[PDB]
Write an enzyme that holds these catalytic residues in place. Structure first.
Site, PDB file in Angstrom:
ATOM      1  N   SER B  49      43.504  45.400  40.372  1.00 38.76           N
ATOM      2  CA  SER B  49      43.050  44.694  41.567  1.00 38.76           C
ATOM      3  C   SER B  49      43.603  45.469  42.781  1.00 38.76           C
ATOM      4  O   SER B  49      44.404  46.405  42.645  1.00 38.76           O
ATOM      5  CB  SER B  49      43.631  43.293  41.583  1.00 38.76           C
ATOM      6  OG  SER B  49      45.054  43.386  41.687  1.00 38.76           O
ATOM      7  N   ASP B  82      39.056  45.721  39.982  1.00 43.01           N
ATOM      8  CA  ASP B  82      38.704  44.302  39.887  1.00 43.01           C
ATOM      9  C   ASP B  82      38.605  43.715  41.292  1.00 43.01           C
ATOM     10  O   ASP B  82      39.405  44.076  42.112  1.00 43.01           O
ATOM     11  CB  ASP B  82      39.804  43.554  39.158  1.00 43.01           C
ATOM     12  CG  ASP B  82      39.367  42.189  38.688  1.00 43.01           C
ATOM     13  OD1 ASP B  82      40.264  41.461  38.215  1.00 43.01           O
ATOM     14  OD2 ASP B  82      38.160  41.861  38.759  1.00 43.01           O
ATOM     15  N   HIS B  83      37.622  42.844  41.540  1.00 42.53           N
ATOM     16  CA  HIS B  83      37.457  42.187  42.841  1.00 42.53           C
ATOM     17  C   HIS B  83      37.531  43.031  44.097  1.00 42.53           C
ATOM     18  O   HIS B  83      38.238  42.684  45.065  1.00 42.53           O
ATOM     19  CB  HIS B  83      38.452  41.037  42.971  1.00 42.53           C
ATOM     20  CG  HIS B  83      38.155  39.917  42.027  1.00 42.53           C
ATOM     21  ND1 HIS B  83      37.097  39.052  42.209  1.00 42.53           N
ATOM     22  CD2 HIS B  83      38.712  39.588  40.837  1.00 42.53           C
ATOM     23  CE1 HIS B  83      37.009  38.235  41.169  1.00 42.53           C
ATOM     24  NE2 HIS B  83      37.978  38.545  40.328  1.00 42.53           N
ATOM     25  N   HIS B 205      34.669  35.975  34.191  1.00 42.75           N
ATOM     26  CA  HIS B 205      35.944  36.040  34.867  1.00 42.75           C
ATOM     27  C   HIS B 205      36.733  34.757  34.505  1.00 42.75           C
ATOM     28  O   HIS B 205      36.149  33.811  34.039  1.00 42.75           O
ATOM     29  CB  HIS B 205      35.712  36.040  36.387  1.00 42.75           C
ATOM     30  CG  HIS B 205      35.298  37.380  36.926  1.00 42.75           C
ATOM     31  ND1 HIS B 205      36.093  38.105  37.781  1.00 42.75           N
ATOM     32  CD2 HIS B 205      34.234  38.169  36.651  1.00 42.75           C
ATOM     33  CE1 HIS B 205      35.541  39.287  38.017  1.00 42.75           C
ATOM     34  NE2 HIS B 205      34.410  39.353  37.340  1.00 42.75           N
ATOM     35  N   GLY B 206      38.039  34.728  34.757  1.00 39.96           N
ATOM     36  CA  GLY B 206      38.774  33.488  34.550  1.00 39.96           C
ATOM     37  C   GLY B 206      38.756  33.025  33.117  1.00 39.96           C
ATOM     38  O   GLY B 206      38.704  31.832  32.822  1.00 39.96           O
ATOM     39  N   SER B 208      41.222  33.573  30.602  1.00 43.49           N
ATOM     40  CA  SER B 208      42.444  33.450  29.798  1.00 43.49           C
ATOM     41  C   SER B 208      42.302  32.101  29.025  1.00 43.49           C
ATOM     42  O   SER B 208      41.581  31.161  29.466  1.00 43.49           O
ATOM     43  CB  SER B 208      43.689  33.399  30.682  1.00 43.49           C
ATOM     44  OG  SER B 208      44.107  34.704  30.997  1.00 43.49           O
ATOM     45  N   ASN B 248      37.349  38.982  31.255  1.00 41.54           N
ATOM     46  CA  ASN B 248      38.496  39.251  32.070  1.00 41.54           C
ATOM     47  C   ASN B 248      39.694  38.367  31.681  1.00 41.54           C
ATOM     48  O   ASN B 248      39.610  37.140  31.732  1.00 41.54           O
ATOM     49  CB  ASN B 248      38.116  39.007  33.562  1.00 41.54           C
ATOM     50  CG  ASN B 248      37.187  40.088  34.125  1.00 41.54           C
ATOM     51  OD1 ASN B 248      36.570  40.840  33.388  1.00 41.54           O
ATOM     52  ND2 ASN B 248      37.082  40.148  35.464  1.00 41.54           N
TER      53      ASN B 248
HETATM   54  O1  P6T Z   1      39.264  37.107  35.939  1.00 38.87           O
HETATM   55  C1  P6T Z   1      40.419  37.534  36.035  1.00 38.87           C
HETATM   56  C2  P6T Z   1      41.563  36.906  35.230  1.00 38.87           C
HETATM   57  O2  P6T Z   1      41.345  35.537  34.873  1.00 38.87           O
HETATM   58  P1  P6T Z   1      42.512  34.600  34.258  1.00 38.87           P
HETATM   59  O3  P6T Z   1      43.345  33.998  35.324  1.00 38.87           O
HETATM   60  O4  P6T Z   1      41.785  33.477  33.365  1.00 38.87           O
HETATM   61  O5  P6T Z   1      43.391  35.530  33.286  1.00 38.87           O
HETATM   62  C3  P6T Z   1      40.672  38.718  36.966  1.00 38.87           C
HETATM   63  O6  P6T Z   1      39.400  39.263  37.329  1.00 38.87           O
HETATM   64  C4  P6T Z   1      41.368  38.325  38.276  1.00 38.87           C
HETATM   65  O7  P6T Z   1      41.377  36.901  38.412  1.00 38.87           O
HETATM   66  C5  P6T Z   1      42.795  38.872  38.364  1.00 38.87           C
HETATM   67  O8  P6T Z   1      43.654  38.043  37.577  1.00 38.87           O
HETATM   68  C6  P6T Z   1      43.311  38.872  39.808  1.00 38.87           C
HETATM   69  O9  P6T Z   1      44.575  39.539  39.915  1.00 38.87           O
HETATM   70  P2  P6T Z   1      45.315  39.665  41.344  1.00 38.87           P
HETATM   71  O10 P6T Z   1      44.389  39.627  42.498  1.00 38.87           O
HETATM   72  O11 P6T Z   1      46.163  41.032  41.323  1.00 38.87           O
HETATM   73  O12 P6T Z   1      46.390  38.468  41.407  1.00 38.87           O
HETATM   74 ZN    ZN Z   2      38.156  37.558  38.463  1.00 41.73          ZN
END
Ligand code: P6T
Ligand code: ZN
Ligand code: P6T
Ligand code: ZN
Lengths: 319, 318
Positions: B49, B82-83, B205-206, B208, B248
């Site tokens: 990121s 990412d993002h 995304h999101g 986990s 992700n």
């Molecule tokens: O989808 C995701 C993880 O989802 P999950 O929280 O379910 O692991 C990732 O694309 C982002 O959200 C990533 O985590 C962002 O990181 P930072 O901006 O450095 O804090």
């Molecule tokens: Zn994300």
């Protein structure tokens, strides 16, 4: 740029200051050390033990050091192998691009220490790489088997080996428990000037972490168990530097700074689970603990003092 | 070797498996992830990121990624931003050597989302670099959440030319995705429709899962995450079958590492060497990822294809 130990310590010896050599194992530790030396315009020795190379699968540590070298091209940076035990560990370090190696055969009798060391010196100096060796063993003075450095033997050892720097045994030991108490600090630093004059080369002090109060108190305040930790007082290191010590090895202080910082975040903000949330403070605590130390060693302001000699050019010194 | 997202996800879409995309920020995280995908012989996406690049002063994360690439030459490894928020961050990632970028303009209205994304697609594709964009916004169903409208996804991909599309189906970032683990509502029903209508790899995304062993360890050793809840692994497996190709995952790795360090701090309060706790933290990451990667379906596929370089990839877009 990448600098040899021979030039970096020669400049420190000449102007009577000392250069801290900080052990590194990962990204935040290297960042914490570099932020401190860059802020102080100080030269630096990044050292990696065989254990660090193992922990980092060798390549990750090599790449991290490259990053430091690339990011701060104006700082003289020596990449040194700490406690190499064989010619093979030395060949390995040189292949990773190191500019300096330590061959530690101090637990062998004098002639074998000389033999092992000479083999490494022939290989390293053929590639312009610096060599530090050790005479005498680490450990505290107070049936004793610690072998402090005998100056007249240090004279002979350097004459027979041709090493660029010598690690001496003066009562320090590795770790956070160097003396039974803060009122029981016994070191054998009176011999440093004698060794320096007889050998005529830069000397290295190992087990020289200081275990500062702020860092030890933070660890114990937040769930840690290190009530008896004691290190080498900074005034003692300054005195030894004035006598001929040019390289000071420090590892435990940076380990404790990072651990204390993480323990504080865990307690104050128990909901946080992002490693950046605590490794960041950890990196920063390393930088903050190091700034006054580097100022006391005296290397601050010296990063610009000299044009750095490359390894290829350094081969000339040994011809 | 360094691999494009377009090739990696195209292979995943064709064989109906998903590839985990793991966020990295330092050495131990990349080592824990690599040990898992190497052990399962699986392709992998390492994503950074803008926060990770700031945390690592950019250069240290670049070099660490080079180390992973050099150490495991036989694993297709995509390095992905990412993002990304602007063409400027995309340029920064491309200059660091990335093979893929995400341009997230999903909080903008459809036309402006399309405009910002197209500009990044022109620039990245000129370099052979893949582009992921997003239509719809993240957030739980339960409200400002805008789930992906499939007929609009079709139009968005046709107008932008992106290589992969992140969809909004009720997941959200972080460890507190749903109020209770008993009422978890998602929109996986439309995933197949979006996949067929767009004809390209989809991204979740999101995702986990916040597995119990990891949650429990944190709370057992001083942590305060009593209400944490993630996406059940079975729902992600179902979505992969409907066309999701990239998943992700970031919070689970953060939790696994934090849980391990907290455990050491309590069981051996005398230790202070970072290796004594980051080591177990790194290993915890690897052990948590192995069954996740097995369920995603990418194990054993690292050797299925010859990786096309960025330079060769330029021809796909000409
Ligand atoms: O989808 C995701 C993880 O989802 P999950 O929280 O379910 O692991 C990732 O694309 C982002 O959200 C990533 O985590 C962002 O990181 P930072 O901006 O450095 O804090
Ligand atoms: Zn994300
Ligand atoms: O002298 C030193 C630090 O002493 P101190 O404990 O005073 O910081 C260093 O040359 C070495 O001892 C180094 O710390 C050993 O590290 P590992 O083998 O990876 O555990
Ligand atoms: Zn030592």
């Amino acid at each position: 740029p990448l600098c040899t130990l021979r030039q970096m310590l020669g400049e420190a010896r000449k102007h009577k200051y000392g250069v801290g050599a900080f052990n590194v194992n990962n990204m935040e530790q290297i960042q914490g050390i570099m932020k401190a030396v860059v802020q102080l315009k100080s030269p630096v020795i990044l050292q990696c033990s065989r254990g660090a190379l193992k922990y980092s699968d060798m390549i990750y540590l090599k790449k991290l050091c490259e990053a430091a070298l690339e990011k701060h091209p104006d700082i003289p940076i020596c990449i040194h192998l700490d406690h190499g035990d064989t010619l093979e560990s030395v060949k390995m370090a040189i292949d990773l691009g190191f500019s300096s190696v330590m061959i530690d055969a101090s637990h062998h009798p004098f002639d074998e220490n000389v033999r092992i060391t000479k083999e490494v010196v022939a290989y390293a100096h053929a590639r312009g790489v610096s060599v530090e060796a050790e005479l005498g063993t680490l450990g505290g003075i107070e049936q004793n088997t610690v072998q402090l450095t005998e100056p007249q033997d240090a004279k002979k050892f350097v004459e027979l080996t041709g090493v660029d720097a010598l690690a001496v045994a003066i009562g320090t030991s590795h770790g956070a428990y160097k003396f039974k108490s803060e009122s029981d600090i016994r070191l054998a630093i009176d011999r440093v000037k004698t060794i320096s004059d007889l050998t005529g080369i830069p000397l290295v002090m190992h087990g020289s972490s200081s275990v500062p109060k702020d860092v030890k108190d933070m660890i114990n305040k937040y769930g840690g168990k290190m009530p008896d930790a004691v290190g080498v007082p900074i005034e003692s290191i300054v005195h030894a530097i004035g006598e001929g010590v040019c390289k000071i090895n420090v590892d435990s202080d940076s380990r404790m700074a990072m651990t204390g910082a993480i323990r504080k975040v865990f307690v104050e903000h128990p909901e946080k689970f992002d490693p950046r949330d605590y490794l960041g403070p950890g990196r920063d605590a390393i930088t903050e603990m190091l700034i006054p130390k580097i100022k006391a060693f005296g290397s601050a302001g010296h990063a610009g003092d000299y044009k750095v000699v490359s390894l290829e050019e350094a081969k000339a010194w040994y011809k």
